[PDB]
Amino acid sequence: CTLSAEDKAAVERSKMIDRNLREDGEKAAREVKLLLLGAGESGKNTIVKQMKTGIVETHFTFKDLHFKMFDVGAQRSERKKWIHCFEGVTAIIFCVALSDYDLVLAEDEEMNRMHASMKLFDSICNNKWFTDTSIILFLNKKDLFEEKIKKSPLTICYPEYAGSNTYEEAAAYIQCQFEDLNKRKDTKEIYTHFTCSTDTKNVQFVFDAVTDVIIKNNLKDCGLF
Template sequence: MGNCARDGEENSNENEPTVSNSNVPEQMKLLLLGAGDSGKSTILRQIRILHVQDFSHDELLDFRGPIHINILEGMRALVEASHQFEIVLDDYLQPHIEKIETEELTADVISSLKILWKDEKIQQVFKRANEFQIHDSTQYFFENLERITSDDYVPTHEDIFRARIKTTGIVEVPFEYEGVKFILFDVGGQRNERKKWIHCFQNVNVMIFCASLSEYDQMLYEDHRQNRMYESLMLFGELCNSRWFVNSMIILFLNKKDIFEKKIQTRDLKMCFPEYDGGCDYDNATAFITEKFKELNKRPDKKDIYVKFTCATDRDAFQKIFDEVKVLMLKESRDI
């Protein structure tokens, strides 16, 4: 995830005027929605740092445990996938595989993780990461394993942006901009969490929907038969046309553009959309996906979909994107 922005590409809507504070409500309710693993929680952490307050030293330390668990889960996923792909791991790895069946990173476990990650067959499995369930940041964490497993390790912003922590329930983040109070609600994206969303739906000024561009060749964690891109499209279509959001502004974050830009070079979008004929071109592919989402809007004459391409782990680029979004929200609020 990280915003490797090209000039002008994040602006899908031209002629966006500056904002006057007249007729802007004193408080705006924002709802952050999307399927699981779309990057919503990372976006929420970014917004908190930008507009509320940075994470304290103790709060950063709270991420150590989840990050260590992400590392262990990543390696266990690789070992399990080796069986799925019938890649037989060498016998000498077996003691190391047994050691990672834990939740604690001892010196022995760390040593075993390093040996496993360097193994040629494990790397063969990792090259097929799109074919099984593994977190996007697995490579990043293993490349930083020495630092992350040190005794005095304090997670950096990039570390916490990349940490995978499943959102359960509802998280509320208030912040202020241009004299207007915003309240941003984030809710769990997995299917079993969505039933809790309904309690947040009343009087929403802005619905921000987050979808991962790079998920077109991946399946859901909770349903290995369902393609993630199709799940996001289905969910967006339901929400975009819901009675709850008739008067709400809709912003679509197409996230993980950095991963997508690399993936599209070798993984044709046609595997997800047979009708796609744009080849391995990033601009063609993003335009096609954008249209797939926008065509789900049943009231295009009355409601615009504002699209932004994001990489939520890139702090500077995300700040630029969100500055534009705030102006859009204040401008649109005059008509809500």
């Protein structure tokens, strides 16, 4: 009543912009946001191949679910700054190569390529920003792991490991070491899996993991838990 003719149309334009922003937010709310993380030589291409600038994004659809992965492996800076920008994602897809047990980093040091992934895994798990976000661990290069342990013992990376030098026995000890880094067992749960090369299981494991986390989260906002 107290507005002019040009103001009453600006109000309508603002209302249309508000109507568009609301539908854009409702459309972006039906999408799954997954943070893709990994140390050096962690064989990331495994899942990226099956699913098909500083931050790279990949968008695929599987079983009427719009997944969006955001690779941050090309960002070489302080993680503390950009780590909070991903608060609220569904789950994290971390990758650890199994052939790193007897390899050293680019800088010749006592630090092993397998322990380097353990340091990054413990950090992202204990971050204050990531408290209830689950982790989907993909152990890459399962084939080369079996061949190398036959020629060289596992005592290089894990000297206290006393057991039979086989594929299943050695891989099980490595899996326990990464799963024991999770201090908060109650709030968050790790999902370990082996990267199938020829098979398409990887995309299926993420589907089972994402739907499981959503069910575990939908009940948290309904009063059952």
